[model samples]
Target chain A: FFRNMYDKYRDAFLSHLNEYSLEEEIKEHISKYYKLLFDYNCLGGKNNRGILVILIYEYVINSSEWEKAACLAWCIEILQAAFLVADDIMDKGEMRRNKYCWYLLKDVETKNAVNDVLLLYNSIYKLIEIYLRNESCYVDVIATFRDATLKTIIGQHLDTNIFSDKYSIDVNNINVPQPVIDINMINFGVYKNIVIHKTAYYSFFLPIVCGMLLAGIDNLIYKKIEDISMLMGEYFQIHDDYLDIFGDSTKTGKVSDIQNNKLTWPLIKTFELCSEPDKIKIVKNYGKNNLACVKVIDSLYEQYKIRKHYESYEKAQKAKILSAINELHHEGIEYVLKYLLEILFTG
Target chain B: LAFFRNMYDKYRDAFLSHLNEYSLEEEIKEHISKYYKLLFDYNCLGGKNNRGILVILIYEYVKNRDINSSEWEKAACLAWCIEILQAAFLVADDIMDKGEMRRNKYCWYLLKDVETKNAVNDVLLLYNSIYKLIEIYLRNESCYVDVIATFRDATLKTIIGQHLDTNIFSDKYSDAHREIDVNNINPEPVIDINMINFGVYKNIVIHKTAYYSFFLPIVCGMLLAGIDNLIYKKIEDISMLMGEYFQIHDDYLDIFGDSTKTGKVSDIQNNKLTWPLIKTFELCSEPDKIKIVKNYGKNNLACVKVIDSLYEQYKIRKHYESYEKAQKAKILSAINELHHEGIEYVLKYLLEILFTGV
Candidate 1:
């Protein structure tokens, strides 16, 4: 729905701004934000976390109000919006998805990034608070939502521990800065947690598990759905980290955060294999070093066969998916349950 | 009242019990366990949870008054809504206060405690649990529209109050109110300063405390009990007055209470808003007032001491004593007014939480 909306109006919106950067365009601004927001909120990564929710409604619910199902979808979407808004604020960046962020777009709204996040959150809770009182079907759904938010916020906090890294800018960006050691600053702990909270938990675990809960499935059945979704969410995150460094940037529209003096699976994997001297040398030359950076990253990746590992893991995940599906099939969930299992397997 | 207030008390306990009961994938269970503890710890202190308490009290009152079991259940559920709404403020207030400890413990923000900020999510998770309890009973209650609207109004006031407070303190904040003496922080005893420099925060504290503690809870209780407007108005009048009394008491406790006795000892230097500071602004001499300007430009220890001293100078203590008496009188009158309208002895039960509890 969002992509289609962007398809029709993205151009017309940007044309109003006529700036080299879509960030500055007036007309294109709202669409730019919505487009970016839609990507996080409405779009799913490899696990189809959003779709897991729809399937939960189909399977658990008796008289499936598609509207109610859609509402569950929106809960996932709106929650994503809240997290992304907070993430951008933490990053302190000027643009998101080639546009000025929601924070910068408004003036009278008078807020910092924190307030912007609260705005997103308050609106969402208002929705749940309003809806939950309507019927029995919605009662459980709001509980799922409350739990999902807690998970996402937890994930985000773990991500923040990465920001205080002196190595991030000083060692990486400074052409001539103080350094020389057998070993140096390690902030991988922060990044690893980020995968669990921000990417792994949210992208995969929260959406699907929450969907199961919201779909008003039986507690036992919901537990099974959640178990599968969470592990798959983790798998999806690992694949995401893999793609960040190994995949094409134009296709992904994002450079490897690791190469950008950040952390990801490729970097973590490389850190495991590379000697201290080699690690220091990479940090010195290419932490944010550009084409030179790209070459070094590519070489380092090949040295570790981080690429090979992901491919094998993908195969293993598929096998696990099969076994998981067999388990679900044995358990007596609805036919739609197969789709939740199948989506992750194929991806 | 201990038995009555103990219902909201059960909330955090319930969260911990749920954590203990659930056995899951080890990693996810650990996450749940951590999140649960953070949430439980955070909710342990600081709210004018009058409504949540009242809702429960009213449920008890209804049950005591021979209301049906089903009706008693609805009151309990709506009471939970009042609690969730109050917790939302705590979540926001922790951010606004630049606070690190809450309920006499470390602030459970995943943002602050990075290793386990995820764990700190337990605090918010607990907040969300309020809806879970609410759902169990009143998901289809008749008065739900009013309940939601009341909650929505409260949420807006809180956020708006927070925003207003932020704006007032953001260096070079000028008030929209007509009185800017630069000398007096305005001495109006009855009217809320929420219309002034810190008006938004003031208004929010009032709205937040009053609505939940007084207005919403009492209204919900009355609405649920099928009580008439005369009774509702009686509850509202006393409730709002008591909310003010409680806020003033908080300020008094901040300054004068033993740290061991009252939880927020360090906040004396924390530069939070207090009635003493407002009182000081009204009474300070020119030099002393200048001292206030110089010492407490927005936040500083000197400004704090100056305000404390000024409160002494103005006999803010005596003033507060009088205010307390006035507050009690107002509530008493309201109770009287309700009696004239033929209300039963519901006010005594409601009043007990305000006057008698530890």
Candidate 2:
């Protein structure tokens, strides 16, 4: 059912891009730019992020404003596309969603990808303006998007240390001096903060918040949902971190975050719990794509019982969400949330 | 002028205050703060502030000259928003053009460690600030949607213009360089350029600079002041004409103007698609055209001198001087004919701003 809805929603979304491309009296080349941006990048994602918008809206409102919901979902999806397109460039990743990344694709002029990302991001605003303009919560939605984007950018700064020279990636920049070596050390506080801001809020919380706002739900209901979303989002990211190394590359396409030495959740945890000697092993062996290193890392996970730990975590998270959904007292809320969690955790 | 300065000052205070509202980690706040400060120093401040000041002046003329009114506050807000828009484009433009300097310093894109890599995000940060300011300041107002749509459309226009200026979608990047297959690495979806007509250059100027620089600030002030739409309709043509002149003068100044007076020599050395180059291409003989194709866009004094000599040889300056004089008369007559009691003052002010530098 969600599959069929997504197909229709995606068509409508592409049509929205088409209308905007023409409405601006843009040149043929830009029209082509929009079409390619839609076809290659936005279309290929797992699309659970967008479908989550639909599910949340349908479940919360108990009514189907399918077109409106889908348009909002498209906005969410496009926002993700914006991030991924730029993220690929920044991370220097070679592929996304089983295709060559937009920045590195054979035909793509690498320089234009920067502006192309902006163009796609701006399309999110244009869609909201067209579809949800008359809603009373219009500016709230806009502010939410802006604030989320602002947070995401800051989160990205934290994750990448894009301006490390200026901020030094240390709290001392804020006049709260600590050990300078702490810069290289992985503090759970800093890691959790980065993950929560970078992925959790925008990816997990924003769609639901946007959907509820569109459904005319009260803003006061947000606190109840916030905790559930945060936990699920954090778990989802940690699972994602695990998958990068352990999951079949044929299924997940290419995995580079581990090789890239990103301070992912598993890496952070390893840094936190490992003995000083094995910690040296992790630093040396990881990120090189060596089989012996891979075996040692897997053995470390085994010795640490990381798999059983995550299995129990997944069980607890599901229970927490199920209980939270039941507390809302809406019939079938559990079913809706199950799908939401499935969409998140499966991918 | 005091009123105008106050608007700039208050806007700076409000923006800083708003930045503090975020509960981001302390370490990141300092980086964000530095980001905002770079935005202020490179993007907003130290320019002529002509476009920004126009927003305030036009609003003051139209709004009972209100010092204490909420409407005036909104106008001031929108004025700074336009300044932010200017800053946004300037940052991106410098990067796109690979410009040497702006405001007599290295272009923000070329700042010590910062170059084109992070310049993309810097431009985006400034662009986002425009809408952020609007949502913060005017989101509750009746015209909030109108203001937002206007800003969004203006951005779209500017980006499309940027597309044209960069020749992003063209057959221009053919394999004359030292590296890689230009054909496969860059397929040929590039299209016609109005058959090398002057329309290409003119369109770029009108869309890229004129809309945001001249028409946007004025129309924003008018909308805030609740002036009649028909009045704006008349002024649109006049504003676009003046915008064209403003851009043409700047392009001409690139070759002829003083480095001390303007930021640097014009963007000519970068092999820019400018009016003088286009005009010379149109009027000069085949040999002279070949001279341009050879000597233009080269980053040396000799190449610049070659293009400069050709521009004078073809009498383009004489042609432009006469054209500017004629357009100035027509624009003034148009303003004089606008019998709006309040609007003509600002219109004349706009014309003077355009005419003086030329």
Candidate 3:
């Protein structure tokens, strides 16, 4: 629905690149070009998330308001693009869809990633200012637009600390943080808290919800969207963890996750599947990216029927969330749930 | 204020007018096109420009008001000083807000969606321009110390404000455990603008608007008017109070004004704890306050609508009115304290221009 709008958004973002066309003087420096292309490409994302905002708008609004509505959607897209550029720069994840990530690929010549992040972030406001046409009516809305972008930055910061914190992740064994035996309680508080801050808020909730607000949806209703969206987003994120190891490159359309030494879902689940002796063997080579280790993880999955387990878990989560949504009968709310379901489940 | 806006509007027009060149040095052009344009937009726009204009107006308002060539030149030079001050904070503000547009122009940081650090140099250029204009205009005088002190101090206070804002609302520093005092709201949609706003807006006002407009302008006016520097010690308090109250009223009208006339919305999405929201905070407790915070961010259509409802519940408009009255009296009294009815009348007239009869 928003393919063209997304393109315009991407074009708009690329168009805002400061000094991207600098050819002389500083042009001799290599980092300059690296950052230029990198920031431009970061504009691309699932873009599907950017699209759902407009879909909800179409479902709720009239055609005449669509131009403003689409512009609003682009506002969200530009924001998302800004975050991606910043996030990619930080994570040092150099490639996306087989292309070099913006920050690393470009010849950006500065140690201050903070300023670069701000620049990208500020683009969204600049966009809101332009699109809002300086309407005094939009002053508050534009203010709101800016505030939201800041929180996302905060979330990315949380993700950063999580990675760098040495004692933070107790992945070796799921011992209690200090008390009860079961890890679920600890995970609920520790893991889910991180999950909500880092993923639930940014990846799932921010984009469409902001659109809803812009379209004049009620606050109570936005709360409802937040609650449901988080559940579905978790399911999607967990499944992504599973695919990192179990799914083939053909199915996942990416490299195996084992190479990254990530605390991915299948790796987490494998400890549940294997006995102590089997686990000990795996611990020796915890995250081997080779074909042999990849096969072993897959064999373990098949043996424990973990694939079936996740498949059912994904299906059940969808059902539970759908049932809660259906009970509300919130005008057109069910479709939003469906939109999330299809995106997570199909992929 | 409209006159000040005219300066910004002209600045925007003048700056935008320069982009037509296709044959210039690309680096300088890019810099010119990006940061130079941004400095104009950020510094030139934002306020009523009444303060910058105050410097211009003080000449006409003084007892022995100088209307010679230097007086007009001084007015332009002083206005240009305001422009540089405006640009300096904008660089930091844009960095902090992660926002791009200023005076309806692309923020300096966003020349093509790619983030560049060279804009920092531009911010420096702006800061330097403050002194540069002083050199250009006030070069023969020894008033450089006073001018530098006022602006530099204002800039420092603003940076502090910006930093404080970033810390509170920024997710890195703020822990969102689902409770609400002044933060936490939103699910799914990745960003919470309120967090950043919650962090820095009050500070932005102190540094960005309140001090910038209220205190700075009058000082410039006094300096240009060559009145008792002692009078600055007089107008400072009242003018700042006026500025503060002015912001409070703006916060009120953001949601309440007729959109056809104001062309805006309540703008809760900025993630701010506005006076009404603070009032709402004091008025509501626990889950209800939490609910209001979550509910009001731009993530929902009805947040502001319901916020309006809450205001109705509390009669927020009346409160703002009372606040404005008290502040206006203070401003007028401060004017009276100046012992110069001319300065007071000029200020009163400028207020009339800004608020349609403030």
Candidate 4:
């Protein structure tokens, strides 16, 4: 069923690109940019965000808007592509989805990637205005995408600030840029705040609710979704964070967050549970990307039984969402939501 | 221009306060406040502000009054919106060029505490602020949709121009090594100078600098004054010619002006596909051809001096004079053909700013 839906989606995506004629009216001029943008950046993602747009519309109506819904899906996917490209540049990331980052290309890295990303982002608005202009939800949809784009940027700003400081300047003062090691700074509350804002809403809530809106759902039902989306969104992110260290590399993509000096949920737990000397070890070793340093962080994570803590956390998040489902009243939505939860989080 | 700055000042405080509507974390808000203040101080406030000043002037002229009229406040805000758009593009453009300074100060991205990461965010904030101001002042107007559509079209063209400048479409810039071939030592060795001939340069100038600089502001002003779209459309060709004229002088001045006064180095230093260099390639002596090929895009002072000396030998300044005079006459002739005194006045004011550099 998913395969068939993805096939339908590929057609819509290609049609949009096919219909795109350069305003400059010279194909030789900008052919390379759109080709690179489409091929390297937009094409290869897991596309769960985009696919969900089509899938949710189908699930709710058991029919297809075909062109309208799929175009919306491409908008979501392209928006994500733009965000990820810019994020990679900001973090100076080398790899994205098992390939080189888009900004790493020739003619792209000389700050031209900055303009390229805007080109990709602005294309979404063009696509919306082009295809979905006549829809009753056109203005609302445009506003939602704009607001979502702004929210993701704000969340990214917050996330960058937190990752920038893992050790307290006052605690265990290792003045090599003075790692801020305050426990209050890297707490579970901080983790939850960042994940919910930075990851949960856009990655999880946006596709689901955008699909619902397009399928003629009442705007008021969006209120019922607000809490469930947050619960499920955090559950997905924290689950992924847990898998970063504990899950099998082959299946989970060999994450190196500890070596990257990421301030993740497990690190919060390690800080919460580790002894004084052990805490000092983290302040010294985080962000070093050395084998011994990684080993030390791994030992601390294991010593803290972080995996057990994750299971309990996952269980509680599910229970609340399950309770919220009873009042939501859209069985079709509830079912699709449950399916996304299981498929997205389970390794 | 100073009047536009005063209008910017009147509304600037409200913008900083309006960002609070985001409901960001207190710490995040603090960071944003600092970043926005730097943005307001450096990128927005500088510049001769001809583009923005014209938006206001055209609006007032079309309405037959000053912007102080309560009815014209939206026009004033939209003029300020044009400045914000300029601010956004300048911040990004500086980063793209690896530019050292803008308006006699360090570029926003080059600020010590605010590096590339925050600079990118600052650029994004500048773009968002343009829309925020539009939403504040013009959302209730009948022409709100047209205004946003115009801004969107200009943004797309500006970005297309930026990409074109990076030499992306040239087959030589293949994705083999992921290296930008546009280094100081050698750029056009593989890329053809003929490929960047007058036709290409004109397209680039129109797309990259001209559309945003000339067409966008004037059209935005005319729309705000509730003028018919056909009136603005009539001047598109002349405005484009003016845009080409504006950038041609900019290219000429970078090398032709006294290096100290302009604070701009020779375009030859970077192997940029600018007007002077392409034309120099066309008309240079055979000996100077080897000299240009050897010296273009080189980092040393001697190489640039050779190119500058060759430029003088080729009499490029006289060539620029001819080019500017030709474009100015063409623009005037086209406007004279319009015969509507109002448009001719508005367009004359726009071109005067382009020609005078004041």
Name the weakest run of 10 consecutive residues (lDDT summed) in model 4 chain A: A166-175
Tens digits of per-residue lDDT for model 1, A1-347:
22233222223322322321112221133333334433433344332444555655555533335544555556555566666555544544344443454444332221333543554454554555433446565545555555556555555543443333321311122123222111232434434445545554555555555555554445565566556655565566777677666766445433345434545566666776788877876666544536776687678788878888778877897678556656765343435445555554343
lDDT of 2: 0.68
lDDT (C-alpha) at residue B307 in model 1: 59
**Candidate number that wins on TM-score, 2 or 4:** 4
Query: Interface RMSD values for the candidates, listed in order?
Result: 15.4, 8.2, 21.8, 8.5
What TM-score goes with each of the models?
0.62, 0.84, 0.44, 0.88
Write the residue-wise lDDT of candidate 4 on B130-185 in tens digits.
77678777778988878887898788888877676656334444333343332322
Model 2, span A69-184: residue lDDT tens: 77778788888888888787767776677666777755455456776777777878877876678888787888878877776765675666522455452211222211111226
In terms of lDDT, the best-performing candidate is 4
Whose DockQ is higher: candidate 3's or candidate 4's?
4
Q: Which lDDT value does model 2 have at B32?
A: 68
Weakest lDDT window of 10 consecutive positions for candidate 4 chain B: B180-189
Q: Pick the candidate with the highest DockQ.
A: 4
lDDT of each: 0.51, 0.68, 0.52, 0.70
- Report the TM-score of candidate 2, chain A only: 0.81
Q: What C-alpha lDDT, on a 0 to 100 scale, does residue B195 get in candidate 3?
A: 37
Model 4 global lDDT (CA atoms, 0 to 1): 0.70
Better of 1 and 4 by TM-score: 4
Clashing residue pairs for model 2: B254-B266
